[PDB]
Assembly symmetry: C2
Homo-oligomer: 207 residues x 2
């Protein structure tokens, strides 16, 4: 069973006028206006509106997918004069499509970790993980890549995991005892036009 | 019979990435990837493209409704390993939705008309008509209103028809013999943000 009864609406619309969703219609409609398409259900009448003669649906408000990604509504074509149904009260869904409008975010502004002095290069210090509220199942709007803004060449970060590792030998605890590392998490695969978030990792060398 | 098998695509897309059209899908799909959604028909494979695992369709080129407003394509869900159909080769349509991106246009840059001198106020001179290539069955993108930029108070134009009429008595042919009238045709009901076109009407008073 093909699943056609759904409309796809792009989120965060900013046009001057209302956003066009689609047109409900029955093949029985001859265009004489004797049919009255009514909209009912979640948001019907307010957020979403229908032109009861043609079936064209519009959205009156700017929709945010990260706040709600689906809307379930019901459609009914009726005989305008007798209120006798022509088609059955079919259920349809308005899928809110995603745009990259959420920057990667770490749970804490500052991490705290340690690593023994004189650790071999590539020793694991801490693994930072940023989240992205966009849709992972579509595009790179939520594919996060990690980079080190501050802390080189002493440290490195695995771009795909966020694992911070020591990158140099002979990191004397006597010489320097606390390093400060900044990590960037940029979405869109970490490429041009992607949104980014940062965090600070305070590291301490131990004995 | 509800008519669900159609997607609505806004014209003149200018986003950096491709434009999302929609997602073909069968309720028989369990998400295990054993299904391969194939797209075929008008523009398939080139202008429009499908993600054969999920069914997501995209448009690779900026589409112009005034150049083509509908695209007919066919969908098939198949068993990826045996090429055995799971669903029937259903036909669907991609409706190109309209934006107001065509200014009203007159057929000729300059009209030519006459009116007898000493004609009563409201005498008909000529009727100019501008066309609008946008969609009349949706919004005011093609509802044209006429206004007189030059030629007052000698002449007036009916906003809804384009009929230019004399507006003053005692228009001596001896005094002045050729008047020049400019008419504007602005869409969107002739209101803020509407597109406009102009023309010049050379008028001559006669005996
Ligand atoms: Ca959002
Ligand atoms: Ca993002
Ligand atoms: Ca988003
Ligand atoms: Ca166009
Ligand atoms: Ca127009
Ligand atoms: Ca247009």
């Amino acid at each position: 069973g093909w699943m056609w009864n759904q409309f796809f609406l792009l989120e965060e619309y900013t046009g001057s006028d209302y956003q066009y969703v689609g047109k409900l219609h029955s093949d029985q409609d001859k265009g004489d206006g004797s049919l009255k398409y009514i909209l009912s259900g979640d948001g019907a009448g307010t957020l979403f509106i229908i032109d009861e003669k043609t079936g064209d649906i519009h959205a009156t408000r700017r929709i945010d997918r990260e706040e709600k990604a689906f809307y379930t509504l019901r459609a009914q074509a009726i005989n305008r004069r007798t209120l006798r149904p022509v088609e059955p009260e079919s259920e349809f869904v308005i899928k809110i499509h995603d745009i990259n409008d959420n920057e990667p975010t770490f749970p804490e502004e500052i991490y705290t970790a340690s690593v023994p002095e004189m650790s071999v290069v590539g020793t694991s210090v801490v693994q930072v993980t940023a989240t992205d509220a966009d849709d992972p199942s579509y595009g790179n709007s939520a594919r996060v890549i990690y980079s080190i803004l501050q802390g080189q060449p002493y440290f490195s970060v695995e771009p795909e995991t966020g694992i911070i590792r020591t990158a140099l030998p002979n990191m004397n605890r006597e010489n320097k005892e606390q390093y400060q590392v900044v990590i960037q998490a940029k979405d869109m695969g970490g490429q041009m036009g992607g949104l980014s978030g940062t965090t600070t990792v305070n590291i301490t060398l131990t004995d």
